[PDB]
Design a binder for this molecule. Structure first.
Ligand SMILES: CC(=O)N[C@H]1[C@H](O[C@H]2[C@@H](O)[C@H](O)[C@@H](CO)O[C@@H]2O)O[C@H](CO)[C@@H](O[C@@H]2O[C@H](CO)[C@H](O)[C@H](O)[C@H]2O)[C@@H]1O
Ligand code: NI
Length: 136
């Protein structure tokens, strides 16, 4: 299984809605600094998932009108992403929040800030990973 171009951008026809799943698989580069997965709406970023190896954290935020909101960094366990290690991310959309799992295990919830779900119809992946598969 080869790799996707990076950054990878694709429309999510029909946008989001409860029960909608977006799956991604790949491998973190050996000396990755950071990588991100964005769910966008027009010129806004409804959900920014940003694992950071320099900061050993997983940052989540929303960018509306070019303004980043309050970051969410809480984690129930140790940073699951590891340099040079393969991973899978499952983003499940629900009515009030996005539920995110990493390597088959729930990691966190992110309450919707941009609530018009159908308008969130673009996926962007960028950063220090080798993207091997996407399921929208
Ligand atoms: C720790 C932190 O909040 N880091 C963000 C940084 O904050 C400033 C400052 O506001 C803060 O008080 C201080 C505390 O130590 O740290 C920094 O000096 O601000 C930058 C720029 O907004 C953030 O980086 C951006 O984060 C976005 C998601 O929130 C997105 O990933 C951008 O790509 C990234 O540049 C720091 O996360
Ligand atoms: Ni496929």
């Amino acid at each position: 299984h080869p790799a996707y171009p990076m950054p990878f951008i694709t429309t999510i026809l029909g946008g989001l809605y409860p029960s909608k799943s977006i799956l991604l698989s790949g491998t973190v580069l050996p000396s990755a600094q950071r990588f991100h997965i964005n769910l966008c709406s027009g010129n806004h970023i409804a959900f920014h998932l940003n694992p950071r190896f320099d900061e050993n954290a997983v940052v989540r935020n929303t960018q509306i009108d070019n303004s980043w909101g309050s970051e969410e960094r809480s984690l129930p366990r140790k940073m699951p992403f590891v340099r040079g290690q393969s991973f899978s991310v499952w983003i499940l959309c629900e009515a009030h929040c996005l539920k995110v799992a990493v390597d088959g295990q729930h990691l966190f919830e992110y309450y919707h800030r941009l609530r018009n779900l159908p308008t969130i119809n673009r996926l962007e992946v960028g950063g220090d990973i080798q993207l091997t598969h996407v399921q929208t």
